[PDB]
Design a binder for this molecule. Sequence first.
Ligand SMILES: CC(C)CCC[C@@H](C)[C@H]1CC[C@H]2[C@@H]3CC=C4C[C@@H](O)CC[C@]4(C)[C@H]3CC[C@]12C
Ligand SMILES: CC(C)CCC[C@@H](C)[C@H]1CC[C@H]2[C@@H]3CC=C4C[C@@H](O)CC[C@]4(C)[C@H]3CC[C@]12C
Lengths: 388, 390, 33, 35, 161, 380
Amino acid sequence: MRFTFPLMAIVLEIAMIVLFGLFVEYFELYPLFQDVHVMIFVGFGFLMTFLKKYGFSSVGINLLVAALGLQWGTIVQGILQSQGQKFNIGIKNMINADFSAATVLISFGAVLGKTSPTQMLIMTILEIVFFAHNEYLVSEIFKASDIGASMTIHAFGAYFGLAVAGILYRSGLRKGHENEESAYYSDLFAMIGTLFLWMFWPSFNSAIAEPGDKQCRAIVNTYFSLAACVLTAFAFSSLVEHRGKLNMVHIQNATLAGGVAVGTCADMAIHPFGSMIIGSIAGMVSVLGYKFLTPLFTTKLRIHDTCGVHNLHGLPGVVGGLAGIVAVAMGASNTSMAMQAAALGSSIGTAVVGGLMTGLILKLPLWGQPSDQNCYDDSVYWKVPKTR
Amino acid sequence: MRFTFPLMAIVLEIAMIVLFGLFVEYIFFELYPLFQDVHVMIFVGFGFLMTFLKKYGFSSVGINLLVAALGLQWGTIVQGILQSQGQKFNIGIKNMINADFSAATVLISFGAVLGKTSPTQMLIMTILEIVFFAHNEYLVSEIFKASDIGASMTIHAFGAYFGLAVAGILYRSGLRKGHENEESAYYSDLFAMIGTLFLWMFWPSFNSAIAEPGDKQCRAIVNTYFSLAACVLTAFAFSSLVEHRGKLNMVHIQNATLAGGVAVGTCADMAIHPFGSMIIGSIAGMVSVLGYKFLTPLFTTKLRIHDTCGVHNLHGLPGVVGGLAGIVAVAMGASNTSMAMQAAALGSSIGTAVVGGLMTGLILKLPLWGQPSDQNCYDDSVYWKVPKTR
Amino acid sequence: APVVIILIILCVMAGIIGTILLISYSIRRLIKA
Amino acid sequence: PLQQTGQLFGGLVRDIRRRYPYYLSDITDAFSPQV
Amino acid sequence: DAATSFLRAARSGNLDKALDHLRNGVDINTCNQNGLNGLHLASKEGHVKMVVELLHKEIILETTTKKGNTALHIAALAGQDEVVRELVNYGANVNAQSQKGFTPLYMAAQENHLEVVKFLLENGANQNVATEDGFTPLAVALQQGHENVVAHLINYGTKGK
Amino acid sequence: SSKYPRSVRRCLPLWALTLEAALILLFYFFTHYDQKGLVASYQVGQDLTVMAALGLGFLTSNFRRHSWSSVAFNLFMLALGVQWAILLDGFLSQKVVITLFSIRLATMSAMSVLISAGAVLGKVNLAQLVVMVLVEVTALGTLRMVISNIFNTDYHMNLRHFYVFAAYFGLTVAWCLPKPQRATIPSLSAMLGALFLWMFWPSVNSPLLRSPIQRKNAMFNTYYALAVSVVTAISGSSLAHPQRKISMTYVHSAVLAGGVAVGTSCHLIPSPWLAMVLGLVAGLISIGGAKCLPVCISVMHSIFSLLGLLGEITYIVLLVLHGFQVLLSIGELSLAIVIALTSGLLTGLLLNLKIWKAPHVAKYFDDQVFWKFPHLAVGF
Ligand SMILES: CC(C)CCC[C@@H](C)[C@H]1CC[C@H]2[C@@H]3CC=C4C[C@@H](O)CC[C@]4(C)[C@H]3CC[C@]12C
Ligand SMILES: CC(C)CCC[C@@H](C)[C@H]1CC[C@H]2[C@@H]3CC=C4C[C@@H](O)CC[C@]4(C)[C@H]3CC[C@]12C
């Protein structure tokens, strides 16, 4: 039915309005919020525009998913911190809502080109529920330190998307697809999202950091981790390709893995050289993932990841959690070992289980899923101009 | 003829310098981030929003830049003169933000006549429309004392109806059935999405830059945030509803997603609760999509008013909706000031915009500014060196 | 308890969309034949 | 519309079959000031 | 050692050392670990005199490397105009295909070597020969933005040899 | 020789990984960490970073087939340059304490190289750009140290010479390279970069200013000068063009004319009208340079050089109002020029070495030299 998507959008918006009227009541962090806002809507949205015939869907469904996501994440994250009661809205609520949107967009990275906007609304709602519950668990029951959210955002979104894409596996797409290819100006546009994410990631890891030494440490550690990550990602992209050529997928994504793997240790006293070590390891791991693990996941494990969000968010997020555990080992933080490890395990497991359930729901032929031949094509859901 | 554009520009700039030396002298750093966001809106969001035309991207972004650069100076001069009653004044961050607001009004009017004007025509339109806008907004803020902190009426409705009047005066009979250059392209629409996203993200700074620090600024930011969030959902839903086979339209996603930010402006600082801002954003998106689908063809064909970017459906109709939402807010108690004064401000904005746009378009209808022919409309090559390769 | 809200809220959304689709979906089965 | 079919709930299903196809027109025909 | 020294001399253009090695008894058809003989290396480095001298001493002109590239393939990919001209003058097959289906015209077109493209077209290179991907020299020149090569390929059409 | 590019599978990764490991080791041995306006201070450096990455990366992407390399190589150059500038500013100004101000200053030092590289982008590979980054940061630090030792100024305050140093360094390096164009989507992406540079350039003109009123007046002067320069550049482009059309390429470089012209004196100009006059004069000089410099390689870097010289000259003129200091300031300018030229010559002769595997002169301004593309024959 062509009316399923407008119906679900209108019903979800009405539900959001009712929930806000039921639960919601009414400045130094606003620039950091705006940096996170730019990341969420430009960086992720245009980072995904590398596909030659899916740029409209990439950026537009990014905007739609994140716009629904900030409202639904606001509601869910408040009702948990309020324990079912009315809560007020400040800048921190907005920042956390954009964080929930980030998690959903990371999972959307795994299913880009093979899902409908209706499936995107459904996965937004369900994934935000699961993400907010796991994040509340980590932040309040385990009380682990995840200020940059290598575990609660990046690893969670990556493995949620991987579970969804595994459930939504198509046999006809395992050997590749004709539309699953980048263009020249498409990669030029994807560099916009890459650059904005790289520039504003220090605000991502320091927005809700405790003011004082912790926020400054988050900023400096993120900056130097990204600085080392760019060099290592360039070096390993040249290393893994024929004749030392650079791969635009690597430069677009693996250059940002340092901001993911430093998130747990962002506010910890890990020193700029330790942050640079983490960023270099993250860049190398991301490039190696793109070169070797993604074909093995697509062909053998039957998990297709369109944007390679495993190599950017999951493996660097797991590396960030392990780095948090090691930093706890050598006195860089006063948080417990077992709580960090439990946060990592709970994030990964909750992501996998929620992704399994959400993908099973998304597999019902009611959401206008595209055919195998029509994957990675804007014309299934958009009016496309005649010329590029 | 061949030198009208540089000569008019150098004369205008020398006039700006003389006026600045005659009238202008030298909280700032707390408002500077919001001014930076508004500046990004003015020079990137508006500039790239209009780059959807396949052969008019250069002229879109470049004339946007030129118009806004002249507009900040001229708006500073005119608004400071009006505020100081002809005395010398010192500029602060508020002067810069208000000058960018005047430039925004001129860019909104420019969106109506995109592709059918010359840079000289835009210089003249900027100069005249800043005077008209500043006088109307001075009347609204000081004589009516209405509350329009997000300027749904003084900026959006004013600029939209000013541009509509100018386009009606500058109507071309040969452009009624369309034009081969008046269509979008893939990467042009991606650049337009760049502009759309920057406007959408930084709109809370637009609506809260002038608002009084404390609860009013925070309410403006939160209300704009959630109104835009609801507006995106309703714009997507009604774009899917109104088009053939349920396909989404890039025009709707590019423009109607900012209708919630436009329509929440008057009620931005008022206490309407975040749910009330979500209702305004949800309706603003509905009305913008319906306007783009139905009212724009009727305006172009029946009313002989061609509006290129659909700035009516984004600024005029959502501006009148925000103006009326502010009237219902004072009636519901969410605001000081009278309902009669809000209604007077709305009516004055519309009427001054229409009258000034008629006068400005009559001035621009003279054959002295090198306006393009019917074939050369929506074509960069009239004024720019266009590369052979796309 | 707040977990039950997200569940009750999720249950209400799931019940609404499902029922609406079920009605139009059924009427399609009654109408096509 | 008043013929008996002999099938249980035949009148009801025929009523639905006759009217519900026009459901889309039942919303678009209302866009008039007379309504 | 002798074969390695001969191949090094062929790569460096030291024709005197290579002629000395051939005098001492080094086989002229010896190739490196990548399947490249002295003709391939000289064609890569643009050593026209070495190419002509090796062709005189009865090197196998249509010897392919481990990737299936002939000397003409390598000279077209390296953009050696004079080496391409001499190889064609000595009877190199201009329509040879490598393992992945590349022709000398394809390698000249993908690398924006307009002179090599023009000479190959004038010597009967068929631009309708596609690779295993279905790509033509025109298609790869369009993808890479080589506008002069695209224009020359379109204007030539099917004028033949 | 062989126009097909030589394999960099062993040169580029080893070079980059060795550089990164050396930076890590130096940071461990020499760097260390340690309020109310933390976010406000972070904002200036963040604006500098946005400009350096985005504006200077996309501004030089107007090339039909070198946009990838421009953007990504600018990102790589910034990432390397900030770290090396942190270490070298620590070494030549004293253990190294990493504050946000030090990161901001390192970002400025990296922006110097990013401005210089616009004269050589499209004619070099990544390793040559690494050499350029290292040598140029070293030369700028040496210049600042020499100025601080001779004229008894602060080392960090000597960074105001970076416009003219970057312009002449880029010109000198580009002059030493071997000797040898635009599309529409690449020109629009470049407008985006130029717009971000033009919008955030008031942050370039006041990162080193401590007094809040000085930053006030500097930002005001830069904003108004940049507005006047945009108007003058867009309108006067038609005069300085053979076909009497506006050139996007001229507009990209010339919009920054007012910001460059008042950069060294934005905090000394007392009234906005003087900043507007300077912006107008800078725009007119940009038009004249566009109309004249090609007659007498990159025209935009030549006009940037002349604009930086004009900015230093108007600093000289304005400082007298606010004759020995005139001689001292001309001496500082000449020393900066001489050091920029000499270090650019050294960098140019270093870049001409065969070991870097530079692209063939027929393969300039082409992404295929450095990047993977599908359906291409690879190897031999
Ligand atoms: C999140 C990832 C990394 C780990 C967990 C993923 C697991 C649970 C997922 C991903 C791969 C999935 C399988 C991939 C392919 C198919 C084929 C389909 O016809 C039936 C389901 C089946 C057999 C999936 C079952 C669930 C599965 C095993
Ligand atoms: C990827 C998995 C295996 C995690 C291991 C990452 C390693 C390389 C990281 C994670 C934790 C890091 C350490 C955390 C804390 C310390 C103590 C501090 O005073 C200096 C930095 C130093 C010494 C760091 C060095 C690098 C480090 C050991």
